[PDB]
Amino acid sequence: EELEEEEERNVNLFQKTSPSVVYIEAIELGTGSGFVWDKLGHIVTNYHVIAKLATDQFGLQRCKVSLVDAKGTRFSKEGKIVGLDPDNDLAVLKIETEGRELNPVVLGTSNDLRVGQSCFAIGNPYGYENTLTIGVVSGLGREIPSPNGKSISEAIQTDADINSGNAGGPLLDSYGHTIGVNTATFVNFAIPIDTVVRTVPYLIVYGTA
Template sequence: MAALHPLLRLLLLRPPPPPPPTSPPFPTTRRSSFSGAAAVALLLLAGSPPPPPARADIDGGGEDIDESRVVRLFQEASPSVVFIKDLVVGRNSARESGKLQAEGGDDGEEEGATVEGTGSGFVWDTAGHIVTNYHVVAKLAGDGSAFHRCKVFLEDSSGTSYSKEGTLVGCDPSYDLAVLKVDVDGDRLRPALIGTSKGLRVGQSCFAIGNPYGYEHTLTTGVVSGLGREIPSPNGRPIRGAIQTDAAINSGNSGGPLIDSYGHVIGVNTATFTRKGTGISSGVNFAIPIDTVVQSVPNLIVYGTSVSNRF
């Protein structure tokens, strides 16, 4: 016990340790409370599911909004677009083919016929009138050495394809326009929605539907690249006010519709600028404005080809 007394005395002589502070200094309080809040937030984040990704689809289909709109646009507009074939047969075989058609219908190409050209068009009304370019059907009148016939391939509202003989009602070479007539029940036709070219703006979306190189119901997309352009007509006169677009227009697209984002026809595809010797579109394409078409087509339907436009 005697040996323990000095140790006890030393312990007793030491000053007692300072009591723990009842409230830490302000900076410590902020740091600790911030750390605690951060820890709580991290725990909440770790325990909660990740936020859903931004939706870019319609009706849960997983498609982009613009993509779905274009798909629907094509589905609604394509039944109004027709495929036109210019068939040529010799005079002797023409009589035979006419006999075959009288006996067996008109849903195919005649024997001995050769496809000389193809193009596009669109249904104007339920009376069976088809609008196309003049240069697509310019040879229907014949030149004495061959006999030209026009076959129009259509699609009804149920998606069934069929073909009919097309007769030339009237043409307007000054605007590269022509009207054909097919004998079809009105309920099998889907007239195109006619819009206006007034108020078009450079940069707005547009879509071309046609049959380039014989590939039926082809859709190409682009924008209105320019307005008020001037292009030559088949008779050499200028067509003023043409619409320029970068939507691809190639051989066989002629006569097909250029439509806007609402499915309304704003022009008739008619020409493309190609680099000499290539035959490939450069992306500079032209359509006749629909306001010009609306002025010309009713006259062609009622009066036919005017005397001044007959070659």
């Protein structure tokens, strides 16, 4: 492109990662983002994003997930809760792929981050297009033994604008790897990808951390 090198990396990073980002609507008969964990149809998001569906339930609460498959085709499916972890603000959902091929994130690591490197936050703000915000890693939080709801252990602080429009979506590094999960239930913060890598396999298999 006739774009600068940095613009080129940004543009490419978005083209290759936004197909992993999903849009989540909490309907009552609350909106958020999430991302594709695997080809089976597991979706990671924030607990706050699906808080009513998981607690109120009451029978009426449903969960619609919109995304894109490997061909580029927008589509939508009912999302079922597989596991919750409100302590780390994590939740896993499962959709039925039904032969659709998904685009899983590429997991990175959060223990070797350095304050000053680029970070990229992607969300799906209104159900239509995905959105990109860019900043740096501003801070690497301290270890919090019992996080309890409103406190992230090892939180990644960033100055990439993070709001409701992209909470639950991935925080990426300059290689396009996912190093965190955007939150907003609480100057912006992500849950480190290392906490998610330790926890998500237990939510899938046991249904709790």
